[PDB]
């Protein structure tokens, strides 16, 4: 890998933008979640602040490689999940919000980490390991909550899955080339995503049967 090649830098501008914009949506989503869940406000605002600081780290990685982020590309990439989150929040559908932020986005991030980290540039490897270590000293707020409210949240979780899991496959196709340029394979990302998401769904309470069903709706 030539971290100074135009071709790397081109792909980085989109890929690093995605992580930057994702941290921004994470910050905003946690505040909206604090508002949907007033009894948990203090905790969620504390998480919001971590995600803002992490965004700064990722901004420094782009600066380190003299690349400016393609924020429009990043916004487009998140658009379908952003719009579904906003709609759900406006309807008070906190379960759907939590699926989007805490399952989909979360699992997408762990998988991205899992695939990116062995092929990262030094400066970014350091920053990213830092961020992930900090993240992993926490439990996943929405997984914990959904597990706690599983039986009553089950129908909305399935709708939310039907509506959002397909968007993930779209997101992955959009970055197949950039991922390859950065020595990350789409198939690898798909596999690791499905692993993190299945494991999260099982943890919150879904059966193997439910997981297979939720997966099948993932394919249309
Ligand atoms: C699957 C699309 C997202 C993959 C991006 C994962 C790599 C994290 C990169 C963060 N950064 C570019 C600052 O190093
Ligand atoms: C590369 C796609 C992921 C974008 C980065 C967003 C990370 C926010 C994760 C926050 N979390 C789910 C732990 O609360
Ligand atoms: C690609 C950079 C993404 C940052 C790492 C993703 C956050 C890990 C989530 C773990 N959690 C906080 C829920 O335990």
From Swiss-Prot:
Keyword Metal-binding tagged: yes
Name of the protein described by the UniProt record: Aldehyde decarbonylase
Give the co-factor note. Answer: Binds 2 metal cations per subunit. The catalytic dinuclear metal-binding site could be either a di-iron or a manganese-iron cofactor.
Q: Which UniProt keywords apply?
A: Iron, Lyase, Metal-binding, NADP
Annotated binding of Fe cation 2, by residue = 51, 106, 138
Spell out the SUPFAM superfamilies in the cross-references: Ferritin-like
What is known about what this protein does?
A: Catalyzes the decarbonylation of fatty aldehydes to alkanes. Involved in the biosynthesis of alkanes, mainly heptadecane and pentadecane. Requires the presence of ferredoxin, ferredoxin reductase and NADPH for in vitro decarbonylase activity.
Transport keyword on record = no
Name the domain of life this protein comes from.
Bacteria
Please write the reaction equations for the catalytic activity of this protein: a long-chain fatty aldehyde + 2 NADPH + O2 + H(+) = a long-chain alkane + formate + 2 NADP(+) + H2O
| Family according to the record | Belongs to the aldehyde decarbonylase family.
Q: Might you give the EC number(s) for this enzyme?
A: 4.1.99.5
Note the effect listed for residue 113 to F. No detectable effect on alkane biosynthesis activity in vivo
Which Gene Ontology molecular-function terms are recorded?
A: aldehyde oxygenase (deformylating) activity; transition metal ion binding
Q: Which residues bind Fe cation 1?
A: 23, 51, 54
What the entry lists under HAMAP family is as follows:
Aldeh_decarbonylase (MF_00931)
Q: What is the lineage of its organism?
A: Bacteria, Bacillati, Cyanobacteriota, Cyanophyceae, Nostocales
């Amino acid at each position: 890998l030539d971290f100074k090649s135009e071709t790397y830098k081109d792909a980085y501008s989109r890929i690093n933008a995605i992580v930057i914009e994702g941290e921004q949506e994470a910050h905003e989503n946690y505040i909206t979640l604090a508002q949907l869940l007033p009894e948990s406000h203090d905790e969620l605002i504390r998480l919001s602040k971590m995600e803002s600081r992490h965004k700064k780290g990722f901004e420094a990685c782009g600066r380190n490689l003299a690349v400016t982020p393609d924020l429009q590309f990043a916004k487009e990439f998140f658009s379908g999940l952003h719009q579904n989150f906003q709609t759900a929040a406006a309807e008070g559908k906190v379960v759907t919000c939590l699926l989007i932020q805490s399952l989909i986005i979360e699992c997408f991030a762990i998988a991205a980490y899992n695939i990116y980290i062995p092929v990262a540039d030094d400066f970014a490897r350091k920053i990213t390991e830092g961020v992930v270590k900090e993240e992993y000293s926490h439990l996943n707020f929405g997984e914990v909550w959904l597990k706690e409210h599983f039986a009553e949240s089950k129908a909305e979780l399935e709708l939310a899955n039907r509506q959002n899991l397909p968007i993930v496959w779209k997101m992955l196709n959009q970055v197949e080339g950039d991922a390859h340029t950065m020595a990350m394979e789409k198939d690898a990302l798909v596999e690791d995503f499905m692993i993190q998401y299945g494991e999260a769904l099982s943890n919150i309470g879904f059966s193997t049967r439910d997981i297979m069903r939720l997966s099948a709706y993932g394919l249309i």
